[PDB]
Design a protein around this nucleic acid. Structure first.
Ligand SMILES: [Mg+2]
Ligand SMILES: [Mg+2]
Ligand SMILES: [Mg+2]
Ligand SMILES: [Mg+2]
Ligand SMILES: [Mg+2]
Ligand SMILES: [Mg+2]
Ligand SMILES: [Mg+2]
Ligand SMILES: [Mg+2]
Ligand SMILES: [Mg+2]
Ligand SMILES: [Mg+2]
Ligand SMILES: [Mg+2]
Ligand SMILES: [Mg+2]
Ligand SMILES: [Mg+2]
Ligand SMILES: [Mg+2]
Ligand SMILES: [Mg+2]
Ligand SMILES: [Mg+2]
Ligand SMILES: [Mg+2]
Ligand SMILES: [Mg+2]
Ligand SMILES: [Mg+2]
Lengths: 110, 117, 142, 56, 150, 47, 103
RNA sequence: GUAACGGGGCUAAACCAUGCACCGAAGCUGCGGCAGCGACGCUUAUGCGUUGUUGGGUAGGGGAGCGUUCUGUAAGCCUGCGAAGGUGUGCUGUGAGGCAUGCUGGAGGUAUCAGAAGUGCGAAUGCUGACAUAAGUAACGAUAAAGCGGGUGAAAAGCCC
RNA sequence: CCCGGCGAGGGGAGUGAAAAAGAACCUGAAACCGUGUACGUACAAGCAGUGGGAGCACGCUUAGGCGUGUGACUGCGUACC
């Protein structure tokens, strides 16, 4: 029971998500919710909603058992960059790459 | 008649990028840099096949000189002893018996001194 | 078939003893350098160093004489604006006699780490006595 | 203040080694109920060291 | 090419390229260095070379017995089943079928079929004899072709 | 049998394609020399 | 237990039961080759030659293998002269069972 | 900064004279294979079995090929029991390349022998698009100024009162 | 139907030959950016290679330093146009 749960088109740079994501890899789901609550990033509340959804998908679809559950694999990838025009001085134009992210959390007991 | 192209462009690049597997950084991924390193690898691959015969022929002398000074004779007198004694040409690799068997090399040095005597 | 390459696992090593009291400077270090590499053995390759451990007894008593007693250089630079320094041979024997043979063999030792790996096996000991009786070293001349 | 060459992914990654965060590990409990909170901080309900603070 | 000869930007005082015209194929849309026009590929083909080629081809067919001649080859009614059954009786599939008079009844038949064709004295090009498996060439048509080639 | 024979030996020459590859020997400037009025198309000299 | 011989220029150190690479000959797969030329024979003690190729020395060994050597990329390339070429090479070889090495 | 033997270091490990060794290149000789140009012998829609000799190479000349697109052959052939394309592996030619096959793909591709070129990219301060880098670094736009309570809301320094 | 803010987005169920065709949609390469495993690496110096090459992890043949991946160390070696 792998029960992969992901999010697509998240509003983040993708680098700042890895600072949160690398700490939670290997830890328990009970401890993981406690870390993300008091750790302060905008991506922390985003990954919390994906992590709680990942546990919720294991409860309803699969046979649940949230008392003992670890996170085996976790990773984030770069998304479709929204392109805009930022006004810079002396008639120069900056491309201003607004990046998006693909948060993915594979949570499983085995 | 237009040639749509495409098929041969990447197929030629896969020849270099396959042979470029192992190189550090952009040399194994980026083609423009890989195309340099594979040609440069071919230059050294060509040159080192000449230097293989140099390296080993020099490196074979080390252990022959090593075993010679154990028995109490110089390298110059050792090879000269085999040459002057009834023709008897012999390679430097075939004295590798000296490393495995110590008493086998002793007979080569014994009659080498008899040549100069 | 290919040639027999030596291995770091199977090595001779052990210990030797060499006395520098009645031996000339440089000529001894030359003979110590070749034995430290293992050129007289089945070393047979640069990348595998099978060479035996070697020591010195009475490094301060090494014979040099001539004009080299006063006029020898030992030039070394620190890195700084005016860090160039010079120390004659008699001053090097006066304080820390081990540097005489060390820099004399370090020049004979090749290139970088594997040459310094030979320098790790060297033990000068400028004092009178020592204790390798743990290892039981063998005495030899030349 | 202009780079003459392009830095590598290695040089990028070795710079980002020290940007990694630390774990919390100061999560404590109240003497009355459970209530997981940071050390020297008030809970969601308002319980601090057993004493009720901020009843709103 | 549809477009103008405006300079995209100034000649000097910038890191951008020279930019002479957008219509050049080095740039984006608008290009074609060496434009090809519609042209006549009809070669000369000499009269003695053309006749000499036909005399060679007809000599090769009679050597390999691909040509089979018959007296008074003609279909009664303009129908495909009549000719298809007739060629099935003769044990033939691909045939040129040249005739001197050029009868109208045989012209309508075999127009549907790709393998079986029909032609007159002025037809019978050099490619068709090499392409098709067999050829009729009736004894009426043999006297016309022999006099034509001489 | 429409395509069976080959052309005569030496009749159909390949010819200089040119401007393709270092190994060919006709690459780089392509039989026109280094710089000069011989190179740079449009130049040349009258009869 | 070992001996040495000359086959096609390239001599080798060979013992009984060991397979070694040699140069291609025109002798068949089923046919056996006989080396009269030896520089040393060893059984219990070492026995070298006095003069070139002693009479008593002999090695009977059949030649059974099918294959060619690994391909090597020969690249001749000079910097900034506008020149390059690539070449391959196979080098035919044969193997030997070594039933000989007899006194 | 040793900085006028390459460095260590040497009273021969220097220099001069004599002689015998050894080292030392892609030279030469040995062994095998390929290619161009002359001869001798089996023999001539000429290839082998030999012999002699050549084979660094830009500008540049001459000769011989591979592959890509399209037409003829081809209403043939292969193919939903799996094409083209993509990604691996093995094998093969002196090389450009070819053959087989796993996986992905799910509908066309095309032997042989010729013909026709928009026929092969690594560059031109090339061009278009995408994606890096510097870097999560500068900056976050008049130094007139915010603070606190109570609402709504998932969440309130910025909204409302 | 479940998480979530009666969202965004995703997981099941279901449609369909295919959901690995989900509307940012046939085929989905490379540059580019991560996760996982194997190996190397914090006393070591320079176009980051090649030649030699121990050891370790995956496969052999029943041993025969054999294949694949990594390359401690080491001879030589200053990109391309
Ligand atoms: Mg403006
Ligand atoms: Mg050589
Ligand atoms: Mg520029
Ligand atoms: Mg146009
Ligand atoms: Mg006319
Ligand atoms: Mg030029
Ligand atoms: Mg000129
Ligand atoms: Mg030559
Ligand atoms: Mg040549
Ligand atoms: Mg096509
Ligand atoms: Mg070019
Ligand atoms: Mg561009
Ligand atoms: Mg910041
Ligand atoms: Mg800075
Ligand atoms: Mg700032
Ligand atoms: Mg502002
Ligand atoms: Mg798609
Ligand atoms: Mg280290
Ligand atoms: Mg080196």
């Amino acid at each position: 029971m792998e029960t992969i749960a992901k999010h697509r088109h998240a509003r983040s740079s993708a680098q700042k998500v890895r600072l949160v994501a690398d700490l939670i890899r290997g830890k328990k789901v009970s401890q993981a919710l406690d870390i993300l609550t008091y750790t302060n990033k905008k991506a922390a509340v985003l990954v919390k909603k994906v992590l709680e959804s990942a546990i919720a998908n294991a409860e309803h679809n699969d046979g649940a058992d949230i008392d003992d559950l670890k996170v085996t694999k976790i990773f984030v990838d770069e998304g479709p960059s929204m392109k805009r025009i930022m006004p810079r001085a002396k008639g120069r134009a900056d491309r201003i790459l607004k990046r998006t992210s693909h948060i993915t959390v594979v949570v499983s007991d085995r | 008649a237009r040639v749509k192209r495409g098929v041969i462009a990447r197929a030629r690049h896969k020849k270099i990028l396959k042979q470029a597997k192992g190189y550090y950084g952009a040399r194994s991924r980026v083609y423009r840099v890989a195309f340099q390193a594979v040609i440069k690898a071919g230059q050294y691959a060509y040159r080192d096949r000449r230097q293989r015969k140099r390296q080993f022929r020099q490196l074979w002398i080390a252990r022959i000189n090593a075993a010679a000074r154990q028995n109490g004779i110089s390298y110059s007198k050792f090879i000269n002893g085999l040459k002057k004694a009834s023709v008897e040409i012999d390679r430097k690799i075939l004295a590798d018996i000296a490393v495995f068997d110590k008493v086998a090399f002793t007979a080569l040095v014994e009659k080498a001194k008899a040549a100069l005597a | 078939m290919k040639t027999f390459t030596a291995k770091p696992e199977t090595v001779k090593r052990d210990w030797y003893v060499v006395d520098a009291t009645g031996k000339t400077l440089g000529r001894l270090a030359t003979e110590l350098a070749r034995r430290l590499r293992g050129k007289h053995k089945a070393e047979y390759t640069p990348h595998v160093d099978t060479g035996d451990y070697i020591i010195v007894l009475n490094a301060d008593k090494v014979a040099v004489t001539g004009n080299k007693r006063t006029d020898k250089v030992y030039y070394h630079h620190t890195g700084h604006i005016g860090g160039i320094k010079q120390a004659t041979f008699e001053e090097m024997i006066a304080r820390r006699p081990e540097r005489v043979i060390e820099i004399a063999v370090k020049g004979m030792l090749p290139k970088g780490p594997l040459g310094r790996a030979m320098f790790r096996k060297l033990k000068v000991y400028a004092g009178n006595e020592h204790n390798h009786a743990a290892q039981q070293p063998q005495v030899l001349d030349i | 203040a202009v780079q003459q060459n392009k830095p590598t992914r290695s040089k990028r990654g070795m710079r980002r080694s020290h940007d990694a965060l630390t774990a919390v590990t100061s999560l404590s409990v109240d003497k009355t109920s459970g209530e997981k909170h940071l050390r020297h901080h008030i809970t969601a309900d308002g319980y601090y060291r057993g004493r009720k603070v901020i009843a709103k | 090419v549809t477009g103008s000869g405006k300079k995209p930007w100034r000649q000097k005082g910038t890191g951008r390229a020279r930019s002479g015209s957008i219509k050049s194929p080095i740039w984006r849309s608008g290009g074609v260095t060496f434009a090809a026009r519609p042209q006549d590929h009809s070669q000369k083909v000499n009269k003695k070379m053309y006749r000499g080629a036909l005399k060679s081809i007809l000599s090769e067919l009679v050597r390999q017995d691909r040509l089979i001649v018959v007296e008074k080859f003609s279909v009664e009614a303009p129908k495909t089943k009549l000719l298809a059954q007739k060629l099935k009786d003769m044990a033939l599939e691909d045939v040129l079928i040249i005739t001197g008079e050029l009868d109208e009844n045989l012209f309508l038949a075999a127009r549907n079929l790709h393998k079986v064709d029909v032609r007159d004295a002025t037809g019978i090009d050099p490619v068709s004899l090499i392409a098709f498996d067999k050829v009729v060439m009736t004894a009426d048509a043999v006297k016309q072709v022999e006099e034509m080639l001489a | 049998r429409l395509n069976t024979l080959s052309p005569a030996e030496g009749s159909k020459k390949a010819g200089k394609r040119l401007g393709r590859g270092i190994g060919s020997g006709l690459g780089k400037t392509g039989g026109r020399g280094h710089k000069g009025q011989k190179s740079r198309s449009g130049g040349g000299v009258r009869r | 237990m070992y001996a040495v011989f000359q086959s096609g220029g390239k001599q080798h150190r060979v013992s009984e039961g060991q397979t070694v690479r040699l140069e291609k000959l025109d002798i068949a797969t089923g046919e056996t080759v006989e080396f009269a030329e030896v520089l040393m024979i060893a059984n219990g003690e070492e026995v070298k030659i006095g003069v070139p190729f002693v009479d008593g020395g002999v090695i009977k060994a059949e030649v059974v293998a099918h294959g060619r050597g690994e391909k090597v990329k020969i690249v001749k390339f000079r910097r900034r002269k506008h020149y390059r070429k690539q070449q391959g090479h196979r080098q035919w070889f044969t193997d030997v069972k070594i039933t000989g090495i007899s006194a």
